[PDB]
Amino acid sequence: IKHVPGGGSVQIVYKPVDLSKV
Amino acid sequence: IKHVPGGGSVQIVYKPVDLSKV
Amino acid sequence: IKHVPGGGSVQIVYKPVDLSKV
Amino acid sequence: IKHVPGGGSVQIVYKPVDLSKV
Amino acid sequence: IKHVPGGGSVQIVYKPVDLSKV
Amino acid sequence: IKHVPGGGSVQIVYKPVDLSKV
């Protein structure tokens, strides 16, 4: 019995710029 | 019995700039 | 920006019995 | 931007019995 | 920016019994 | 019995700049 969700994962975000207004 | 969620994960964010206004 | 691998994950094992021989 | 691999994932095993020989 | 691997995860094992022999 | 959430994790943020206004 094993449970192994989301293993070995990568995310990359390159040069993001945020100009949001609130 | 094992539970091994999210193992080995990477995140990269490269040169982010935040100019947000509140 | 979020990364959430294996997030919110569940395992349930109910009344397991082990009689293994080695 | 979200990344959520294996998110919300479930396993259930009910009354397992192990009789393995080694 | 957040990274949250395995976040919010649960395991339950209910009334396990071990009679293993070596 | 093991529970092993989020093991082996890396995060990298490279040369971030924060100019946020409140």
Author numbering:
A (entry chain C), B (entry chain A), C (entry chain B), D (entry chain D), E (entry chain E), F (entry chain F): 297 to 318
Question: How do the authors describe this structure?
Answer:
The assembly of tau into amyloid filaments is associated with more than twenty neurodegenerative diseases, collectively termed tauopathies. Here, we describe twelve phosphomimetic, serine/threonine to aspartate, mutations in tau, which we termed PAD12, that collectively induce the *in vitro* assembly of full-length tau into filaments with the same structure as that of paired helical filaments extracted from the brains of individuals with Alzheimer’s disease. The tau sequence ([Fig fig1]) comprises an amino-terminal projection domain (residues 1-150), a proline-rich region (residues 151-243), four microtubule-binding repeats (R1-R4; residues 244-368) and a carboxy-terminal domain (residues 369-441). The tau folds of AD and CTE comprise residues from R3 and R4 and the carboxy-terminal domain.
Finally, line shape analysis revealed that residues 297-319 of wildtype tau297-441 displayed reduced peak intensities compared to tau297–391 and PAD12 tau297–441 (**[Fig fig6]**). Residues 392-404 of wildtype tau297-441 also showed similar attenuated peak intensities compared to PAD12 tau297-441. Such an interaction, which may resemble that between the two protofilaments of the FIA, could inhibit filament formation in the absence of phosphomimetic mutations.
